[PDB]
Design a protein around this motif. Structure first.
Motif, short mmCIF file in Angstrom:
data_model
loop_
_atom_site.label_atom_id
_atom_site.label_comp_id
_atom_site.label_asym_id
_atom_site.label_seq_id
_atom_site.Cartn_x
_atom_site.Cartn_y
_atom_site.Cartn_z
N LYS A 179 0.81 -1.21 0.00
CA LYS A 179 0.00 0.00 0.00
C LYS A 179 0.86 1.27 0.00
N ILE A 180 2.01 1.26 0.65
CA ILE A 180 2.84 2.47 0.70
C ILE A 180 3.69 2.59 -0.52
N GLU A 181 4.41 1.53 -0.86
CA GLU A 181 5.27 1.58 -2.02
C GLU A 181 4.50 1.36 -3.29
N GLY A 182 3.24 1.00 -3.17
CA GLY A 182 2.48 0.76 -4.38
C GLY A 182 2.78 -0.62 -4.94
N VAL A 183 4.02 -1.08 -4.82
CA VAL A 183 4.39 -2.41 -5.30
C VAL A 183 4.64 -3.34 -4.13
N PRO A 184 4.83 -4.63 -4.39
CA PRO A 184 5.07 -5.53 -3.27
C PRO A 184 6.58 -5.74 -3.10
N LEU A 185 6.97 -6.46 -2.05
CA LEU A 185 8.37 -6.69 -1.80
C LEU A 185 8.86 -7.87 -2.60
N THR A 186 10.16 -7.89 -2.87
CA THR A 186 10.77 -9.00 -3.59
C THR A 186 10.44 -10.19 -2.72
N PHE A 187 10.72 -11.41 -3.17
CA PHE A 187 10.47 -12.56 -2.29
C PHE A 187 11.62 -12.47 -1.30
N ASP A 188 12.80 -12.19 -1.85
CA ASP A 188 14.01 -12.03 -1.05
C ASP A 188 13.87 -10.93 0.00
N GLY A 189 12.93 -10.02 -0.21
CA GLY A 189 12.70 -8.97 0.77
C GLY A 189 11.85 -9.57 1.88
N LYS A 190 10.67 -10.06 1.52
CA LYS A 190 9.75 -10.67 2.47
C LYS A 190 10.50 -11.58 3.41
N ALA A 191 11.54 -12.22 2.88
CA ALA A 191 12.35 -13.15 3.64
C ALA A 191 13.26 -12.44 4.61
N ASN A 192 13.97 -11.46 4.09
CA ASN A 192 14.87 -10.75 4.95
C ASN A 192 14.12 -10.10 6.08
N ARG A 193 12.86 -9.74 5.83
CA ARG A 193 12.02 -9.13 6.85
C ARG A 193 11.66 -10.15 7.93
N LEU A 194 11.12 -11.27 7.48
CA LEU A 194 10.72 -12.33 8.37
C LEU A 194 11.91 -12.67 9.27
N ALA A 195 13.11 -12.69 8.70
CA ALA A 195 14.28 -13.04 9.50
C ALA A 195 14.57 -11.99 10.54
N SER A 196 14.34 -10.74 10.22
CA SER A 196 14.57 -9.71 11.20
C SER A 196 13.58 -9.94 12.34
N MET A 197 12.32 -10.14 12.03
CA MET A 197 11.37 -10.40 13.08
C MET A 197 11.75 -11.60 13.96
N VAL A 198 12.41 -12.61 13.39
CA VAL A 198 12.83 -13.80 14.15
C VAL A 198 13.98 -13.42 15.04
N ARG A 199 14.95 -12.73 14.47
CA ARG A 199 16.09 -12.32 15.27
C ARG A 199 15.56 -11.54 16.45
N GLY A 200 14.45 -10.86 16.23
CA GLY A 200 13.88 -10.07 17.28
C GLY A 200 13.33 -10.84 18.45
N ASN A 201 13.05 -12.14 18.26
CA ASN A 201 12.52 -13.00 19.32
C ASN A 201 13.64 -13.79 19.97
N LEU A 202 14.87 -13.60 19.48
CA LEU A 202 16.02 -14.34 20.03
C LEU A 202 16.03 -14.27 21.54
N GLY A 203 15.67 -13.13 22.11
CA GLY A 203 15.65 -13.09 23.55
C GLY A 203 14.74 -14.17 24.16
N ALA A 204 13.50 -14.17 23.71
CA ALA A 204 12.53 -15.12 24.21
C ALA A 204 12.97 -16.52 23.87
N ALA A 205 13.66 -16.65 22.74
CA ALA A 205 14.14 -17.95 22.29
C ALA A 205 15.05 -18.60 23.34
N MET A 206 16.03 -17.85 23.81
CA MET A 206 16.94 -18.39 24.79
C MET A 206 16.28 -18.57 26.15
#
Lengths: 242, 242, 242, 242, 242, 242, 242, 242
Positions: F91-118
């Motif tokens: 909606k903001i960029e008008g276009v969607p993210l690369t697949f490689d983008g969607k992925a890099n994003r998902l990974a950031s969100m995962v890294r973000g749970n590393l605390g809870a992970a440990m």
């Protein structure tokens, strides 16, 4: 009472079964004649050198010898006993123990130290000998390595080593060593890997031309085991250097 | 004094009942003739490889054998003793033990290591044998698995495995295996799962064509147990590859 | 804003203030001309040798330099920063810092690391220099040693050293060293004690004629500091040997 | 605001500065042309193999690349960031960073992970590149190794390695490597030590002819860095074999 | 010497008194004829399924049987021993033990494992039998439950259960069970609650129609105890389903 | 303000970045058309089953979706956020993210749970999608796996899985799976391994014909992603059974 | 050999001296005729009800009995043994033990369990009896309470109780109880306090008219002890209610 | 400022986001009309009953209500706030929140207590409501359960419960409950399972006819949520008893 000097102690004198002066690297090679042992002489308790002339390889009996790596204290008494064990069993049974006997016995003596082992004071030997009972007297040399829990293992690759710089030495041999060779070629490859071990390990520190510190060696063959002369080694290590 | 060699030590010589060189995977298959064992030969202490030619399967007696996974040191002495327990029971009783006996014995010896088990140094065996007392000499092949606390368990699915890569090998067989088959087909599915085990497990590492490292096998039938030849294996693993 | 490069980081970029590759021995001597530093080049993480050509002595500025012993990583960045702390103060103030200044600054930088110190990753330096502001340009050379908590200490005995083999070297010098002497005699006595430190310390390991590993040195005088050549050291350690 | 992409995050998005899929060995060789990197492709979490096709060496910029050993998660993001740090500095400054700059930067990023390091999740890189600013464009290829506390170290021996089988590989090269050589010879010696690293280390496991798993490589020269083809590798490893 | 096989070991062979393959649920119902036992067959070590065909209920003697939940290794040997204790007491005394005797014995054997219990390896049985000495041979079937500290408890509610899904099953029976009923009805309600136990408990997992995994059962009456056929179970569970 | 919904919270609402109901197995397959996800529906807190109808796979966007394994609570909110992150970036960029983008994003969100992970509460996702930017729309299907420390990984073998029974399912597919195949064949191999996963894992428990519990699936192709029908699954799992 | 059955075990069979099913409340009252005990019947391991029909009061001998609170398992075996300790002393000495004897013995048996006590598995009894050797057969009833360390204490207040709800019951009696009274009035006051204890204590839970769960009682007098009937209690608790 | 009363506190008054008086069981049923909540009233801090008239189920708003289980203290304040949150969002937005909104909000409030949760003081609610936006107003009732980490879950089985005796109650319902039924039949089945929960759990203790303690209930339908009368329950529980 089964001809085990040890087992006699077991029932009649049980009191005989880096806080203190450590180990060093020891190498083992197989060859045409028989086999041999060569090992550093630097005893290190910490990062501090405690002695630079300590013999690590001993002649167990007529056709065998072994080098022990680990706590000097515990490793010495252990080999002396192993020797005795072997000699006594001869004087009693009349004959000497199979090679496979001597080894299984050594193992037992190791398995016995496992207590102290899990407490830091661990030791581990490298056994070699001319198997008077081997079919092909060509490959009659043998190398047995050990565990801490007392496992017995067959070399079956012509060489092996134990100690800090063992990973190094083992690697040097992986290159500088070839099967059936001279009792001059091998004793050469030995002094070699023992040089390389010293390169990548402050705990070893093989041949030092400047101080007069030379690797101790022992060869065993169809004639028996004899401790190589200080001359055959130094004029041998000088040859290795470049 | 119950014809148990073990029990004799129990009362006359009790001193015989990753710090040190680990385990590997071992498979077991049932078939028309009898049953067999096939196991890796890579011993790994840490992530470091300690030996790539160690035999994990031994022939316990004329009509049975077993493979042990866990601390090599402990596992060896344990099977050597098992063998003796059996042989000695024969010479004394004149006859051999039931298969179900040999098993109950092996389990007692395992329960006996429970102490060491809870201290890291654990070991678990896989027992196989041709049950000379089985009604239908067709399904006369058997597989017994073990606990750590010394439980005895019946296969009842033609195959099993123990070791790091067991989970993997079991799954391979869950596909590449079928009941009543050749003593060529099973030995085939064995080198196979032994390959998949090595795929998803760095502690295993089955058939290595480049090095000359092949899986150790043993088959037991109405004729007894015999250790497959290095040839029957290599020219067999080459067949499996693709 | 007090002419301290460091203090600029303090307020504008704070992110700049045996698991990892250890230390070695370093010696300092006073003499007629000025002063000097000579240090081993062996980095040891564990009992394993990690590098045998690491420079431990650096020239801080025109008329001073220092050798740091301890965690190589923490010690490198610390001297570099000290250097810059010095050079920047000059460029800004136009003149250079007193020697007592350079020292008090270096002390502050050490005091800063105390945190990491109390967690194993400690580091301690040895600072030497020609005090352009000393009354008697005869004894214008100086030696400053340090604590871990950041103390600054004056030599006042012509020599000092820091590292694993320091206790050794210090003692050798307590013998092989005499006041006002050649910048050839002192560069000699340094390579010496740097030899004895290696004798009784596997962590050090001075001049190794066989490998080509020679102690690094630096001499500061009324002309400034300059790094001795690889020739003036080897043909100098050869002389020392016997 | 110092042309540091990193430092921008530092102040405008700080959130970007065996429980999880481990490392592997990586080798680095120097030669006539330039330098190269070759590294295994096996990721292992536990003793279990997690992936056999993971690239461990990346090309950071036109004239440089690096391999990172340690926790894969942390090692990936770290190099990708280093990449950007370099590229961004260029586009801003117009010119690129010295080689000595790229390394000092890389080191700071490592020092940055020290926190995570002291918690198991450590990672260590190996950096190589063609110093466009080197006097003698003969020895213009360089190798930088790192600490965990972020130390920067020069190779100065033509080769190096990091990872589990590093001690192995380093030793293989100590024999199979010679100065100024082909970019075919070195790529050869690389695939070699990388084979030997797999021999003595289950965590690595170099060239696997049967599976089609071949080491990843990259060479950098006066033309820049280019990733070696899958063909130049396999038909190269086949050659190495015997 | 009190007719206790156990007590003989106690004095003449004491060595017989989720790291390893866990438990499962077992149910017990009372009825017109006598009583019965039905129990799952899934052994689970961790969340991992270890075996789906393990018999958990055994016939101790002519007129009694028991199911044991807890560590399989410990639970097997314990019941096998209880079996013998009962049989031996007979052959010696000529007559068999009261039911209340068999239980008091079983309890002592449990109290015996208390040591191992407080260390994770706990096991708890459920005992049933046709009290040949009961006044009203109508309610002659009995159910005894145990502690971990070895308490003996009477059912007095016509049903009971032990294991992970016990709370489940007990609740299912609280609805689907009624006093005096068929030995078809109860065997029905058993397979039922045993189904419900599998619904709310991954550790159990009762009747599996697809795999052919059916609950094990045993009924005891005035004729004695007999193990229900695999047919009477499957064509019984199919009925239960909807 | 970088079109990241997440990052907006990061700075305007930070409060949005077996004690509790666990995980299950999820598979992923590549094929001619696109790729797909299939996952179990059994949530287990302890050994107790908490729910048997929980959906583990969600459609993240028009041309992608993912399944998450680990703490249900954490895993849910995490994917819901991932979805939004994507939609909002569109909606903001008008276009969607690369697949490689969607992925890099998902990974950031995962890294973000590393605390809870440990701290036990860990979660790991499996991302799949039709890469609208892939050169060869034949192999346009992709599978990305994750670390816990947030590493991103490419499948490159047509299939993958995550969860307790992953090891099992992976192995099944290692057999029952082949490249380019029908969107009927892959969905077939998925319900298959999803069955074998349940065989050797009480935490999973795939297709249960008796209860009406069927695996949740989703396929993505050049037409986008669509959730398979309850019918296409049941009449599909019935086919698999035998 | 002192007429102590226990002491015989002490020297000839020593093996007889909320993880597991807990306690409940028990009350004791004195009166004209003699004395009595009444105790709840709910066994609770955790917050979970394990049994609601467990008898806590037992008749030790002709003229005495006791109720024990604490670990059901440890408390059962303890009273039984006490019983026997008593009966055996009679059979041997021909007469019975003083009441002060029976108590001192019971105390010894408690003192013995102190070990288990200090590990959670504690137990405490309440002893009552008609002292056939009391001067005034009016106040011949007695109550003895105990410690954990084995202390013996005299009631001297007509009532006492032990258990979780004891503090409650004790207080109810501090009100609803008066000296010399009917063996109907006291059996009344007991069921009462046994009701109030259940009000303020989820562990107890006295008379439950809805379920049919009624308090167990026992009255000892000049005639001896006898267990009150289930009728004299229910139609007695119904009276208590309002 | 997003119409969240909570979020206002977040930024304007943050100080508003068995040591202490515990929980109890609560049940939830779906049916023709709408849905309902019924929950015990016994608050127990330890094994000691602290209150027997505590209301656990509250009416959140016009068409929904929820019962909370866990620390009374924490559970009360939490629901009161949830109510407020809902009301405020209406007065501001003008309309009321979706049902799926109210739930996601409650979840957030739970996810917020996760800190205290991991510290013992955990709470967990059971949400129910008439979905004014459900297509088929027949199954317009809904039941949402929660995690401790704040997961939101859909009932989809007609009933559910939370608390100590939830496992019990859930099981009773598994039998005594059927789909589409009276708002009399359900409120009946509820008071039922709530009776069974009380049977197998000292922590609950449902309907007590003798004391006048009756389960609290609430029904919601197309007219709204209304708290059932004390009469409709008691004359309802008397009916259930036998």
């Amino acid at each position: 009472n089964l001809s085990s000097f040890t087992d006699y102690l077991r029932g009649h004198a049980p009191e005989l079964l880096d806080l203190a002066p450590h180990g060093t690297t020891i190498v083992a090679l197989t060859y045409k004649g028989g086999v041999l042992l060569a090992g550093d002489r630097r005893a290190t308790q910490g990062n501090l050198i405690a002695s630079r002339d300590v013999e690590k390889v001993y002649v167990t009996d007529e056709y065998s010898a072994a080098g022990i790596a680990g706590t000097a204290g515990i490793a010495i008494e252990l080999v002396r006993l192993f020797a005795v064990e072997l000699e006594h069993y001869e004087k009693i049974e009349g004959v000497p123990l199979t090679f496979d006997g001597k080894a299984n016995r050594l193992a037992s003596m190791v398995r016995g130290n496992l207590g102290a082992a899990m407490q830091g004071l661990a030791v581990v030997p490298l056994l070699v000998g001319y198997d008077l009972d081997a079919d092909d007297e060509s490959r009659a040399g043998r190398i047995v390595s050990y565990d801490v829990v007392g496992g017995r293992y067959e070399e079956r690759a012509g060489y092996h080593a134990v100690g800090s710089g063992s990973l190094a030495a083992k690697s040097a041999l992986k290159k500088i060593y070839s099967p059936d060779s001279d009792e001059e070629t091998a004793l050469r490859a030995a002094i070699e890997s023992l040089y390389d071990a010293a390169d990548d390990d402050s705990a070893t520190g093989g041949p030092d031309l400047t101080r007069g510190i030379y690797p101790t060696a022992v060869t065993i063959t169809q004639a028996g085991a004899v401790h190589v002369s200080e001359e055959t080694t130094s004029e041998l290590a000088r040859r290795i250097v470049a």
